[PDB]
Write a protein that binds this ligand. Structure first.
Ligand SMILES: *[C@@H]1O[C@H](CO)[C@@H](O[C@@H]2O[C@H](CO)[C@@H](O[C@@H]3O[C@H](CO[C@H]4O[C@H](CO)[C@@H](O)[C@H](O)[C@@H]4O)[C@@H](O)[C@H](O[C@H]4O[C@H](CO)[C@@H](O)[C@H](O)[C@@H]4O)[C@@H]3O)[C@H](O)[C@H]2NC(C)=O)[C@H](O)[C@H]1NC(C)=O
Ligand SMILES: *[C@@H]1O[C@H](CO)[C@@H](O[C@@H]2O[C@H](CO)[C@@H](O[C@@H]3O[C@H](CO[C@H]4O[C@H](CO)[C@@H](O)[C@H](O)[C@@H]4O)[C@@H](O)[C@H](O[C@H]4O[C@H](CO)[C@@H](O)[C@H](O)[C@@H]4O)[C@@H]3O)[C@H](O)[C@H]2NC(C)=O)[C@H](O)[C@H]1NC(C)=O
Ligand SMILES: *[C@@H]1O[C@H](CO)[C@@H](O[C@@H]2O[C@H](CO)[C@@H](O[C@@H]3O[C@H](CO[C@H]4O[C@H](CO)[C@@H](O)[C@H](O)[C@@H]4O)[C@@H](O)[C@H](O)[C@@H]3O)[C@H](O)[C@H]2NC(C)=O)[C@H](O)[C@H]1NC(C)=O
Ligand SMILES: *[C@@H]1O[C@H](CO)[C@@H](O[C@@H]2O[C@H](CO)[C@@H](O)[C@H](O)[C@H]2NC(C)=O)[C@H](O)[C@H]1NC(C)=O
Ligand SMILES: *[C@@H]1O[C@H](CO)[C@@H](O)[C@H](O)[C@H]1NC(C)=O
Ligand SMILES: [Ca+2]
Ligand SMILES: [Ca+2]
Ligand SMILES: [Cl-]
Ligand SMILES: [Cl-]
Lengths: 511, 516
């Protein structure tokens, strides 16, 4: 195959090496990939090599049905919140993500918590039912080890209509130990009440050279800690009955990856066997279980967190500073987010539809309040050019007009208005209608002709556009694809189609 | 590792043929060019080939100095309006371009005429002075050669005083059936012919050209009627009107030849490579007078003034140059019925007229420029050019559509016109221009970001106004945007103009704004 090397001058400033066969010139992908910011690689199949080029690796969610409030939440069946490195851990006390997106301290960010919930809710609807192995009920329907100094016994508990295992072990002892031996499933679950302080510990055989790591759930409020091969999580007093549910995969990886930075250090470590459970102090223990997944317990932990942490104004105040960029006043702690409000509402509505417990709906109804107040009056409302109401992901001065957060704020209002009924849904209905009018009018401002912009800070600050990376662009499409199944407006379908095409390299026509 | 074919799947839908050497994959430029919409070619040097790649195709004008109203007009020293295929010819009557931009009929489009003038004005300031050869003054300077008239049977000629304009003049009588009276010229280098002319009766002044089409003689007849342009075989006819009063006729024989032989019924002049190589002789028919016969390399100021005079005579009572063709800007935009005004026309005309005023101090030019701001005060629906963006920023429309269109380049030309006028008119009379400019520049600074894609510019805001895809600016309009902003940046020290120019320039060599 006869070819000639040829110098290839690039915009009169750099020379790269190409190849030539008569008139056809061939450019190295090393250059193409960097210069155009595109993707490809050689893929080896049985008796066929093929280079495979992509404009992006991000992919649009394959919607299977029109959206409905009790169904999967957009594309979140495929999200995995807990592996994100901005999640420092799943809180021992609250059973939800503690995030570190903006500083290393670790704070409850409501969005991450709602997305934890929504993603698990969605996986509950799409994944295969979990295998559930029961190790201890305490009934009449063993392999505990009680060393000297310790006692164990089955006892009635009238308070909760069951039999229960009581244990007494001092902290100087080896504790009382239940052999488990699960090779496949790593979500451990048990009912727990402590009389005195103590610990429930889980020993794991890992893939790090066959070593045993132990995860201690201790009855204090201690921040996550990691020494050698011991991981410590504070689960609070548990001096009343509650179900503890812990993903040993996540809990192991977050412990070994413990960092003083805003990102968990990557680790490959996996548990390969849940060896045994170790009880110390004085207390009670029931329903000891290992499951493939515990999606509804994750969903409810998020739901209950939202109910308990909503403030008197119906907001989830965000208790860290956020500096959105030069030009934007810094957001002082206690700011609200339209994305938080909406995602929370979408979570609470789902909790209500499952349980019929009006505590969930009552929280969702209150959560519209911040939508009514401008950013400078402790709300999330912004007005674009004295004409279009908007609900801000970041209620900055000047206004920021972030697209994706806004669309989640609307999906929440849709969820609520479809669920509250005509009377009580009035406020949600009205905020939604106004918001969808704004969105239809303003969508074109986010369209570059070969991508989307993330926000309107170019217009509001007089600077370069803050273009959306491909994964945010895909989110825009997923959002509009969703809206397009609950609102029959042609504009949503047109924009979805064009925005999809951008992902495969299509451009708007030039003149 | 040896050069080998490899299949290359593109976005999981089409397979192209590339090459591979070990790990390095090489993609055909045939694909790269079309998929990313870029440019390149193999260029031949002495025993050495090189492929040359460009992200874009236009270039930014190298601005030399801060802009001022009596200087060159932006980049227009490098425009050549008359060779554009949308210029059907230079009118014999009006001495300015007749254009065919949207319909084949041919109409006087103000923008093309203003640009004709501004470009010649700018060339006057940058080109070398023209060589000027004088063939007849009719005085007593004409004792030695050139003599050179052939006055055949039936015809007469004489030098005669003309009290009307304090000079001697050549009088001619030739019937139109004769071969006419003929002055040998023989210029090989210069092709702009110029002569003062008054006709008593009908007639023609004709110019014979040796051309590069196998040495053939073509004759261009400037005839005393309003007939526009005709072409049979080797004769070209232009109507120059009665000329029964003294006037300077000035004609580019290159253009006049090429427009004639390229005469078409379509929107575009047929391309030709025919050039004149010799202006052989001038032929006078009918009864009249003839003075100051000249051939020059260029006649920039005559072109400029022809444009200026056309603008003064054709301005309407509303101070506009009405555009007399229907214009449908695109689906969603109401059709513009004839008589619509353009902010680009108004501004460019003003920039022309101000320059004419600064040169001549004839207040007719300034007063026409002052009237030309009136359409800027009136909304599109009231037969002006003003649009308002979201109840907040005044704008001056290139196309005063419903809904508003907000075309960027037209707007910036409308502002450079107002700048020229307000800098020139003085405190009292410049008030209106001052105010329209200030409001315009405030709008521009606020709205510039809406035209920035992060790797190009948008031409207009039809995407926002109609709910459709952006009308992205082709690269030559992108460089126009930069040339405009580069100019404004020398008359307004706002940092925003400097930052945008720099970023917009970087887009030309494939830089992008950062993604998040
Ligand atoms: C380990 O796991 C098991 C589940 O497998 C748990 O055992 C269950 O415990 C719950 C208590 O939380 C039991 O639910 C309660 O049942 C009580 C009586 O049920 C029987 O009798 C009634 C007549 O009253 C019959 O109708 C019924 O069919 C049963 O035969 C109820 O009194 C409780 O009602 C509560 O809710 C209502 C509102 O709905 C309140 O108004 C009441 O005041 C009251 O609070 C409740 O329904 C459940 O039956 C147990 N199941 C079994 C099979 O034992 C263990 O609790 C768990 N371990 C720990 C430590 O939590
Ligand atoms: C061929 O080319 C030659 C020049 O190359 C031309 O000859 C010149 O043409 C003009 C014709 O008008 C002569 O212009 C001079 O105008 C003076 C006043 O005119 C102005 O001011 C009055 C105000 O009352 C207005 O009415 C008028 O419209 C103008 O605004 C006259 O006064 C001149 O006459 C004498 O005065 C001047 C100084 O003021 C003396 O220096 C002169 O020598 C002269 O005696 C004169 O009319 C100009 O002088 C001509 N130049 C020469 C050298 O002859 C031809 O016109 C051109 N051929 C054709 C056919 O156009
Ligand atoms: C999505 O969430 C759904 C709702 O939470 C899940 O379906 C539910 O799955 C459970 C099965 O784990 C069913 O609960 C009961 O199961 C018992 C079996 O006895 C055991 O139960 C107790 C604990 O309560 C245990 O301690 C005992 O020792 C036993 O081992 C049945 O006998 C009951 O009748 C009852 O079925 C729910 O019924 C079931 N609900 C529904 C609506 O299906 C679903 O699996 C989740 N899916 C995913 C993919 O996560
Ligand atoms: C630009 O225009 C000016 C007209 O002012 C030209 O300068 C004149 O040239 C004529 C013809 O040779 C002379 O009669 C004058 O003496 C000149 N006037 C001045 C003020 O210099 C100039 O030649 C033109 N230049 C170009 C490149 O077109
Ligand atoms: C309870 O707390 C004390 C310190 O406050 C600690 O020393 C002790 O070991 C704890 N008890 C158990 C059973 O872990
Ligand atoms: Ca029990
Ligand atoms: Ca004379
Ligand atoms: Cl995710
Ligand atoms: Cl041009």
């Amino acid at each position: 195959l006869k070819y000639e090397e040829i110098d290839c001058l690039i915009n009169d400033e750099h020379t790269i090496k190409g190849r030539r066969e008569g008139n056809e010139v061939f450019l190295p992908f090393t250059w193409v990939e960097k210069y155009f910011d595109v993707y490809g690689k050689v893929v080896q199949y049985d008796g066929y090599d093929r280079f495979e080029f992509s404009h992006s690796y991000s992919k649009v969610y394959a919607q299977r049905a029109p959206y409905h409030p009790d169904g999967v939440f957009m594309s979140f069946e495929g999200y995995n919140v807990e592996v994100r490195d901005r999640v420092k851990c799943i809180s021992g006390v609250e059973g939800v993500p503690l995030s570190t997106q903006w500083g290393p301290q670790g704070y409850f960010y409501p969005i991450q918590i709602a997305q934890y919930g929504l993603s698990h809710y969605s996986k509950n609807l799409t994944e295969k039912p979990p295998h559930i192995e029961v190790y201890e009920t305490a009934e009449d329907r063993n392999d505990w080890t009680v060393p000297k100094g310790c006692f164990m016994a089955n006892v009635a508990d009238k308070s909760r209509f069951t039999n229960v295992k009581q244990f007494i072990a001092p902290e100087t002892s080896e504790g009382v130990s239940l052999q488990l031996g699960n090779t496949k499933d790593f979500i451990i679950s048990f009912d727990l009440k402590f009389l005195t302080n103590g610990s429930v510990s889980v020993v794991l055989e890992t893939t790090e050279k066959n070593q045993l790591f132990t995860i201690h759930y201790v009855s204090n409020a201690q921040l996550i800690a990691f020494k050698e091969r011991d991981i410590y999580y504070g689960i609070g007093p548990r001096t009343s009955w509650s179900t503890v549910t812990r993903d040993l995969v996540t809990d192991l990886r977050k412990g070994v990856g413990l960092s003083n930075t805003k990102a968990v250090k990557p680790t490959k470590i996996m548990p390969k066997k849940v060896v045994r459970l170790i009880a110390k102090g004085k207390g009670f223990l029931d329903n000891i279980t290992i499951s493939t997944t515990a999606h509804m317990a994750a969903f409810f932990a998020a739901s209950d967190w939202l109910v308990r942490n909503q403030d008197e104004k119906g907001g989830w105040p965000i208790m860290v500073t956020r500096k959105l960029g030069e030009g934007f006043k810094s957001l002082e702690p206690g700011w609200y987010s339209a994305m938080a409000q909406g995602q929370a509402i979408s979570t609470l509505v789902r909790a209500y539809l499952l349980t019929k417990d009006h505590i969930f709906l009552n929280s969702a109804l209150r959560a519209t309040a911040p939508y009514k107040f401008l950013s400078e009056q402790h709300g999330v409302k912004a007005v674009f050019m004295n004409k279009h109401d908007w609900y801000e992901e970041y209620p900055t001065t000047p206004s920021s007009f972030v697209l994706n957060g806004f669309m989640y704020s609307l999906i929440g209002l849709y969820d609520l208005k479809e669920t509250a009924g005509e009377k009580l849904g009035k406020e949600a209905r009205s905020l939604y209608e106004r918001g969808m009018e704004s969105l239809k009018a303003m969508l074109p401002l986010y369209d570059t002709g070969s991508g989307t912009i993330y926000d309107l800070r170019h217009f509001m600050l007089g600077i370069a556009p803050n273009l959306a990376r491909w994964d945010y662009h895909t989110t825009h499409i997923n959002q509009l694809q969703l809206l397009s199944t609950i609102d029959e407006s042609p504009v949503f379908k047109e924009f979805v189609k064009r925005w999809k095409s951008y992902l495969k390299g299509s451009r708007a026509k030039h003149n």
